[PDB]
Design a protein around this ligand. Structure first.
Ligand SMILES: [Mg+2]
Lengths: 67, 609, 339
RNA sequence: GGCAGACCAUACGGGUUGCC
């Protein structure tokens, strides 16, 4: 008797973990889409990748006075 | 002029490892090497202060045993006690044990002064000094200096340009004896140069190999009653053994000058050979050639032994041949299919002793002799083995405790203290039908090697100190100039670096362009630098397949098998360097590449056909 | 037969927990997104040429002040560069050449890293002098150090090759709590912006969420076929995505508790090394094996463009906090920037 | 018987051809 109760504690630790994850209330797929679609569309205006910003405002191109 | 120049500190990290894998890397096996004592004292005295008192202690114990008389031994025993033993218990920093002190205590009030009086302490001097002191020495710049010296030991390979010959002093057999000098330092040695083409002619290749092999085992610890070999080498047309050199002459030549010899005269001289014989018998060798003509003398006049020639090993395989000078033979060697041992020398010795008295050779003895000498030479020259001396169990000691050597002590003879009875003064084309074969040059490997010890002495007397400082003199002016140029703490400082050193790569396997750079080994890479920069050239261990050695225009060099369908070039300065790279080099990459498979991020992409 | 009473009560749990997910799931993102405007082809230009590291580069990290970064490389050194000028601020060698991950503090004052030293090594940039020195040595895990991420200049969390993460207190150098849960070796971990939550991946092919303060797992995410190399978080603190040696990427929501979108083109065989979102979040970038990242319309899952320029495996990447440009760590020993 | 040569020893002088 050694690995009998060793795998049991692990198997019991599993059912503890399974019941933990099942507890949470969930939300439908349409709810997440809009929240984060709207988030993307809310902050899409202020993206320097999506909005290719002017050469001057861009440092790695040509921003003037540094140091 | 020519003078040999040391390597650099860089070797330490390379060398240190070289030794560690052998085992000659402890208190004893460094100290033993008298240099490894010298640099130890140079360290222990000048830098460490707990060691200094045990060194002047130890040095003055050697200057007690090596003293002349026994009456003057007490004068120095009182000089010692009051200080080196007493003083340390007054400051109470004497760590030495009870029974250690109670031996010297009881016997220095009893006053009896045998040389093994202070011996139980000498082992405790060792005892304490190998603890930390030894370790903390290792971490010294002198310990470094050693490595620098020791490399030069394993780099030493000899030529004929290195030597400055003066005269000639012998012809016989395969070659001729030259009285040589070492131009690097400056001392007289004996070159026994041989002409290679005459050995294949006579077919004396068994005896030539033998005469080499014997010199080594004999020439181990210093013994001034045997002309010891120092260095050995071969060149495409010559072969030479480098040994000690002496002026005097031989006993056959001075038997011509003086004539017959006295009792107290021969006693001294005869005592010289017995210890030479002891040194031969203790390491299992027989000379098989005991003769007055084959014995030399130096500027002082003390004696040694010459042409080994016929000396063959009795170590394990006894030779049953009829070998020897036709005259000084025992009745054992003469017989066909019968073995013998040291008896062959002891008989030849007694045969020689007669000739050093009368002048010829014939058992019966004369009239006007002394009582003790009859009992001696009858024992030496007895036909049986069991009845003869030196062949019962002891060997050399049966000669020692004889009534002839009764007045004389066996420790003073040992040091050339007894004076010499009299002083010596100081005022071709036969073989042109044999060529250089390739089956001949195959058996010349395993020939050229130098004695670790005998060389270490060569420097000790000559120019160790004047070089020591002169290299130090430039080790400062180097780092001084290195500082002037803005310093760099040696790259491989605090990291997990293993070792580093020097090597020469050819820039690309195509041109004839050698560039030499400095290298740093790592667990996962190899970098290297030139004269000034910090590394900009690189090689991983992932990038490597395997590593072999190879001959390059007769030079053993390193191949660096590349993963990307190519190869790389290398070369070293000294011989051993090459090695210690290879060992941890071969391991580092394999263990590097071993654990590449176990990691998911670091791995090579899995193969997919 | 209690081991049997647990296993048969697990298959019923697995199938019933997954029915709770699929009872919620009726429509997909592709349906949600198909309506809105497309991205258009975003094709950037190389800007900077960071000659520096000689050996292969692994993990990097972005300086919070959007002009600096620390980059780890096999060469046994960690470099800090000025992205604007092309000047190497400082060059530092590690005590152990087995490096894997590098990090950068939020303040931009202290820094951490490590690898097969099985240790997170940490330093200070500006001591009471200027010469850079080791601050502390962190040990605990038996295996290697996969990745490490800061809380502030007093706490931090790592991930290791003994299949566990751990929180650390800088002051002491002791584990605040421990995060046992993964069976496979842990690889990449991602911080929450709020810094009270975190997610991580492993070789078992699962993603797990973790309550930071407590010290336990909250959710299990199954889907990926092969080893899960990369991971990153969405700005709002309730969404994240990952890359893998399967040669696909996936997206996940937390309240909803499942996979959302798969990013699988049929002309893609090689794996991802580390992934990252944009500021807006719509853009996802995967550290591909073919020496260039591909952009993804994280909404529709269409390929936007590629950053061809490297000549060897792309090991990692990152965005500036202000979304200005993109770094790229690669095995060709180079770091280029794109905008 | 002496000398000379051959064979060998050679950091050394002791062990079949020709000539009186
Ligand atoms: Mg000889």
């Amino acid at each position: 008797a050694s690995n009998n109760t060793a795998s049991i504690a692990q198997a019991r630790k599993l059912v503890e973990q399974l019941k933990m994850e099942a507890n949470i209330d969930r939300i439908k797929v349409s709810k997440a889409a809009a929240d984060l679609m709207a988030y993307c569309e809310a902050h899409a205006k202020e993206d320097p990748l999506l909005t290719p910003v002017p050469a001057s405002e861009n440092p790695f191109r040509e921003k003037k006075f540094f140091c | 002029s020519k003078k040999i120049l040391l390597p650099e500190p860089s070797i330490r990290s390379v060398m240190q490892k070289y030794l560690e894998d052998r085992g000659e890397v402890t208190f004893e096996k460094i100290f033993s090497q008298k240099l490894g004592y010298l640099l130890f004292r140079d360290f222990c005295l000048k830098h460490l202060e707990e060691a200094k008192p045990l060194v002047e202690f130890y040095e003055e114990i050697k200057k007690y045993e090596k003293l002349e008389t026994e009456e003057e031994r007490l004068v120095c025993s009182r000089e010692i006690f009051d200080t080196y033993i007493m003083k340390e218990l007054l400051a109470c920093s004497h760590p030495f044990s009870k029974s250690a002190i109670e031996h010297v205590q009881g016997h220095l009030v009893k006053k009896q002064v045998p040389p093994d009086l202070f011996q139980p302490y000498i082992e405790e001097i060792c005892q304490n000094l190998r603890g930390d002191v030894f370790q903390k020495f290792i971490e010294s710049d002198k310990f470094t200096r050693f490595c620098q010296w020791k490399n030069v030991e394993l780099n030493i390979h000899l030529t004929m340009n290195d030597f400055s010959v003066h005269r000639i002093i012998g012809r016989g057999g395969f070659g001729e004896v030259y009285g040589c000098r070492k131009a690097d330092t400056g001392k007289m040695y004996a070159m026994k140069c041989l002409d290679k083409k005459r050995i294949k002619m006579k077919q004396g290749e068994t005896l030539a190999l033998n005469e080499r092999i014997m010199l080594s085992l004999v020439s181990t610890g210093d013994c001034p009653f045997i002309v010891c070999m120092s260095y050995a080498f071969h060149t495409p047309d010559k072969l030479s053994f480098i040994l000690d050199l002496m002026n005097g002459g031989d006993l056959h030549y001075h038997l011509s000058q003086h004539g017959v010899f006295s009792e107290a005269d021969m006693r001294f001289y005869a005592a010289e050979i017995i210890l030479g014989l002891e040194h031969m018998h203790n390491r299992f060798v027989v000379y098989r050639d005991l003769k007055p003509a084959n014995i030399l003398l130096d500027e002082h006049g003390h004696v040694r032994i010459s042409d080994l020639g016929l000396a063959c090993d009795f170590s394990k395989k006894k030779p049953h041949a009829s070998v020897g000078t036709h005259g000084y033979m025992a009745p054992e060697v003469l017989q066909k299919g019968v073995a013998y041992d040291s008896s062959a020398d002891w008989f030849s010795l007694g045969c020689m002793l007669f000739k050093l008295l009368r002048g010829h050779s014939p058992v019966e003895l004369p009239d006007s002799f002394s009582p003790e000498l009859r009992s001696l030479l009858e024992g030496l020259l007895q036909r049986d083995v069991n009845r003869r001396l030196g062949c019962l169990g002891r060997g050399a000691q049966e000669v020692k405790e004889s009534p002839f050597f009764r007045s004389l002590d066996w420790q003073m003879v040992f040091l050339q203290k007894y004076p010499p009875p009299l002083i010596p003064p100081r005022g071709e084309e036969d073989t042109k039908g044999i060529k250089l074969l390739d089956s001949d040059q195959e058996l010349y490997r395993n020939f050229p090697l130098t004695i670790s010890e005998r060389w270490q002495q060569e420097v000790a007397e000559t120019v160790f100190d004047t070089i020591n400082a002169e290299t130090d003199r430039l080790e400062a002016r180097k780092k001084t100039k290195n500082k002037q140029l803005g310093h760099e703490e040696d790259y491989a400082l605090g990291k997990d670096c293993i070792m580093h050193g020097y090597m020469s790569k050819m820039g690309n396997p195509f041109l004839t362009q050698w560039q030499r750079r400095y290298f740093y080994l790592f667990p996962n890479r190899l970098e290297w630098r030139g004269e000034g920069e910090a590394p900009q050239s690189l090689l991983t261990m992932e990038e490597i397949q395997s590593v072999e050695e190879t001959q390059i225009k007769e030079r053993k060099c390193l191949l660096l098998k590349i993963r990307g369908g190519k190869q790389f070039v290398l070369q070293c300065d000294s011989d051993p360097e090459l090695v210690q790279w290879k060992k941890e080099l071969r391991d580092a990459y394999r263990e590097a590449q071993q654990l590449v498979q176990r990691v998911p991020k670091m791995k090579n992409k899995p193969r997919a056909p | 037969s209690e081991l049997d009473q647990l296993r048969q009560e697990a298959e019923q749990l697995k199938n019933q927990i997954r029915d709770a997910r699929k009872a919620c799931a009726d429509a997909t993102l592709s349906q949600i997104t198909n309506n809105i405007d497309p991205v258009g082809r975003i094709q950037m230009r190389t800007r900077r040429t960071l000659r520096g590291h000689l050996a292969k580069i692994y993990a990097m990290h972005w300086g919070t002040d959007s002009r600096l970064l620390v980059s780890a490389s096999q060469d046994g050194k960690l470099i800090i560069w000025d992205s604007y000028t092309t000047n190497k601020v400082h060059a530092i060698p590690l005590r152990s050449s087995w490096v894997m991950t590098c990090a950068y503090a939020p303040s931009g004052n202290y820094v951490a890293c490590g690898g097969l030293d099985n240790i997170c090594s940490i330093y200070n940039l500006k001591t009471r002098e200027g010469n850079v020195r080791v601050s502390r040595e962190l040990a605990g895990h038996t295996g290697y150090l996969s990745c490490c991420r800061f809380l502030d200049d007093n706490q931090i969390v790592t991930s290791s090759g003994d299949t566990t993460c751990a929180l650390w207190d800088i002051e002491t150098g002791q584990q605040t709590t421990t995060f046992t849960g993964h069976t496979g070796d842990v690889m990449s971990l991602s911080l929450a912006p709020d810094t009270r939550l975190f997610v991580s991946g492993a070789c078992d092919a699962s993603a797990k969420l973790w309550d930071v303060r407590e010290g336990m797992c909250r959710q299990t995410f199954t889907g990926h076929e092969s080893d899960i190399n990369a991971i990153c978080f969405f700005p709002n603190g309730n969404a994240f995505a990952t890359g893998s040696d399967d040669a696909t990427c996936r997206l996940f929501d937390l309240r909803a508790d499942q996979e959302l979108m798969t990013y699988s083109h049929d002309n893609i065989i090689c794996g991802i090394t580390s992934v990252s979102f944009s500021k807006s979040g719509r853009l996802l970038l995967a550290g591909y094996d073919d020496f260039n990242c591909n952009v993804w319309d994280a909404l529709k899952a269409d390929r936007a463009g590629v950053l061809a320029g490297h000549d060897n495996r792309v090991s990692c990447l990152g965005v500036t906090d202000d979304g200005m440009a993109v770094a790229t760590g690669s095995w060709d020993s180079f770091l280029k920037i794109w905008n």
